[PDB]
């Protein structure tokens, strides 16, 4: 009928979702706690000159989103059946009270701002237009058009001008959605098409600094992977908004919105496993768990992280295509089916809207999409994810580009490690509560699974907060063909003076990693964690070593040639609040198996050669100790390591330096993948140094002529051999080229 009615609507299927069953659960249970709060709330109101709660005062401004905030829950409490107070006027006359006295008081056009900006132009009127949207019947017209008014007053039109300062990202993203309800409650269209307009600069990808990368990796804080919790805010943020404004005359038309919807497949699945979205890309937050300040007393944690990620994706799919749409929620409906630790049709944190879109999405018909195997390199953000019929690993790094770790707010103070070439896994179709099972407030952070550090003693919060402590290194990253991988990092310790070359290739059911040029200065111990597995209170998991090899009932195996391997199975107690000021104290036991390799005191070119099989059976692991010709480790020196695994027709190396491995040559480091397939063989490449200068690869293989190649490959032979010569760019981008043999 009306536009205007349309878009209020909409906003509210999007805000108190529409369609579900109010005396079923889950959601009768959310609507009576609504219920609940809503009455104490009311019971507490108090208009005074300077607060409308008492102990929340006006100023600092937070006491006036905090107003809001409870107002917006009596709202709730009013509109919706089964709270106990659905169409109660005598509380529809005290969210009145409460609004006009906020309104008379503070928030209002004679009202010059104080203190943090972000109070009025965000927390605050994000609030007001919902509750103006909801009540919209039972407040008047002077009400409407003051609520819009403020809004005008708090955010001009100026505030979606110049993408910069406060008007950036998520910021902008959240400026845009007041400016449109104004527009929508206040019947404005300029306000609305204002709205759709300022979302454009927020669609193009960046490549440097806070954003999405054209690989899919997500930024924030300069230099700290994000994708985890940062990508929940972005994706729900424009989803509300494509959502809101999709089949409108404001509907997002801009091509680069494109850019967006690409990135839930893109930058997002990729990093989500059963439900859980990966510890490498969740930053400070790995650290919070129990918060004191959360009432629900929900843990967080990679699945509480995920299920956010998840919500988030449901969101946005009202606002893409109908193929996008069956794409997602199959993946969301896979998820809903694997995740056996935090179920996501009962998450508790969940309001009703969420609920409805994921239940709706799991009472359809259509396929649960399993994850796909295969393998993404987000090297733009240091990440590596790889998937296997037998495992699901996600690999952290860090660069002159990529901290080492975030610590602020007091979280996260001993996270030094988490990027020290860290390999998470998880073996496929079993409980994936590895990191979620009071991991974090246990795990001993000096022996992190994976990576090479020296035992030095460090300080809480050593390198500096805000993603502040960089290694000083240019070459991390690797080449992929979509399905294997060699990944390589120079390490340099965080606030050591460790460096290591560190290698991982992830193939059809190992990963080998090699390590080499492992020097440290620092008088003590240099350790190579081979695994760290947490085993959940009183584990019983049985440890088996034959072979050279070890294995983890329920995990998996480790293969370590040339022996010296040391493990150590402890019980460790710890609470969030040892990782994060503002957890509870709460305790918890968990018994640990850990693995590793002692180079000794101050090493100097020290090396370890080692395969993990995540998943593996006990049986599988020994047969592959006793394998001797499946894997050819080609090189392991701090100039090249490289490996051959004839089953896979794979040859995979990284060139620290200019340099020959097996029959491969380069003129520069650079990451090469070479697969030959009965009569074609594909070469990959990339150059993690990111120089962009042109490199020259030589692989000694008859070949007999060019199928395809990148337009950034030139071919300069063939015949004997093929030589290339590749003009890389900076991202470490994997460039490609087909040929045929022989």
Partial sequence: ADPYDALRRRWLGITLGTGYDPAAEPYASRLAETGERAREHRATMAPTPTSLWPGHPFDPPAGITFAYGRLWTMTEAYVQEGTGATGDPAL???????????????????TTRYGNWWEWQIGSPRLLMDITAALYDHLGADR?????????????????????????????????????????????????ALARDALSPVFPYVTKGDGLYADGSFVQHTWVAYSGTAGQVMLDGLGRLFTLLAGSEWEVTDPGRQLVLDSVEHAYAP????????????????????????????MRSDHFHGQQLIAAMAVLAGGASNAERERWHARIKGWIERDTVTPVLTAPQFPV????????????????????????????????????????????????????????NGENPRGWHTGAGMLTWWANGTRADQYTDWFWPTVDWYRLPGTTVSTKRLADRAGGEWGAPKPDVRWVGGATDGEYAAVGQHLKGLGSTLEARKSWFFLDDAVVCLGAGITCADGVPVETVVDNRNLGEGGTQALVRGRHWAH?????????????????????????????????????????????????????????????????????????????????????????????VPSLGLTAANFWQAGTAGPLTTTAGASVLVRRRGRTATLRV?????????????????????????????????????????????????????????
């Fill in 92 to 110: 529809l006359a005290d969210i009145l009270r409460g609004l006009d006295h906020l309104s008379a008081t503070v928030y209002h056009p004679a």
């Fill in 144 to 192: 409407v058009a003051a609520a819009c008014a403020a809004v005008d007053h708090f955010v001009p039109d100026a505030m979606l001008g110049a993408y910069t300062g406060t008007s950036t990202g998520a910021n902008r993203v959240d400026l845009c959605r007041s400016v449109a309800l104004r527009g929508v409650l206040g019947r404005a269209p300029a306000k609305i």
């Fill in 552 to 644: 983890l009932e329920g995990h998996g195996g480790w293969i370590v040639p040339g022996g010296a391997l040391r493990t150590l199975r402890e019980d460790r107690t710890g609470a969030w609040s040892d990782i994060n000021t503002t957890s509870t104290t709460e305790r918890r036991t968990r018994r640990w198996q850990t693995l590793w390799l002692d180079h000794g005191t101050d090493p100097a070119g020290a090396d370890y050669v080692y395969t993990v099989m995540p998943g593996a059976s006990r049986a599988a692991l020994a047969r592959r100790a006793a394998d001797r010709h499946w894997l050819t480790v080609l090189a392991n020196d701090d100039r090249r390591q490289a490996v051959s």
């Fill in 686 to 742: 990339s150059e993690p140094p990111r120089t962009g200068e042109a490199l020259e690869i030589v692989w000694d293989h008859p070949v007999g002529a060019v199928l395809r190649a990148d337009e950034t490959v030139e071919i300069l032979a063939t015949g004997r051999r093929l030589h290339l010569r590749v003009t890389p760019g900076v991202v470490c981008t994997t460039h490609e080229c087909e040929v045929t043999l022989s």
């Fill in 353 to 408: 809207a969420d609920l409805t879109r994921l239940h709706a999405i799991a009472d359809a018909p259509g396929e649960a999409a399993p994850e796909p195997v295969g393998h993404h390199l987000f090297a733009a953000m240091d990440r590596a994810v790889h998937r296997r019929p037998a495992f699901t690993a996600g690999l952290a790094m860090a660069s002159d580009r990529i901290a080492h770790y975030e610590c602020g």
């Fill in 271 to 298: 990093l989500i496993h059963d439900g859980l979205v990966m510890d490498t890309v969740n930053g400070r937050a790995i650290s919070r768990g129990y918060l004191k300040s959360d009432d629900l007393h929900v």
